[PDB]
mmCIF file of N, CA and C in Angstrom:
data_model
loop_
_atom_site.group_PDB
_atom_site.id
_atom_site.type_symbol
_atom_site.label_atom_id
_atom_site.label_comp_id
_atom_site.label_asym_id
_atom_site.label_seq_id
_atom_site.Cartn_x
_atom_site.Cartn_y
_atom_site.Cartn_z
ATOM 1 N N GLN J 1 26.320 41.846 76.811
ATOM 2 C CA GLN J 1 26.340 40.324 76.434
ATOM 3 C C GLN J 1 24.781 39.739 76.853
ATOM 4 N N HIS J 2 24.710 38.938 76.039
ATOM 5 C CA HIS J 2 23.498 38.114 75.539
ATOM 6 C C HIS J 2 23.629 36.665 75.882
ATOM 7 N N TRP J 3 23.716 36.204 74.332
ATOM 8 C CA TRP J 3 23.785 34.750 73.989
ATOM 9 C C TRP J 3 24.344 34.841 72.525
ATOM 10 N N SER J 4 24.213 33.225 71.997
ATOM 11 C CA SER J 4 24.539 33.027 70.659
ATOM 12 C C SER J 4 26.016 32.395 70.477
ATOM 13 N N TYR J 5 26.187 31.332 70.170
ATOM 14 C CA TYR J 5 27.356 30.743 70.144
ATOM 15 C C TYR J 5 28.201 30.914 68.929
ATOM 16 N N UNK J 6 27.763 31.950 68.099
ATOM 17 C CA UNK J 6 28.003 32.026 66.753
ATOM 18 C C UNK J 6 27.232 30.935 65.619
ATOM 19 N N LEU J 7 26.565 30.475 65.844
ATOM 20 C CA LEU J 7 25.523 29.436 65.549
ATOM 21 C C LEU J 7 24.329 30.214 64.780
ATOM 22 N N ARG J 8 23.936 31.464 65.055
ATOM 23 C CA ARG J 8 22.857 32.216 64.910
ATOM 24 C C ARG J 8 22.942 33.393 65.526
ATOM 25 N N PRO J 9 22.196 34.746 65.112
ATOM 26 C CA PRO J 9 22.212 35.708 65.638
ATOM 27 C C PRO J 9 20.873 35.961 66.591
ATOM 28 N N UNK J 10 20.810 35.248 67.666
ATOM 29 C CA UNK J 10 20.172 35.362 68.735
#
């Protein structure tokens, strides 16, 4: 796990 809402690689 990290982050990124699928909006941007992150």
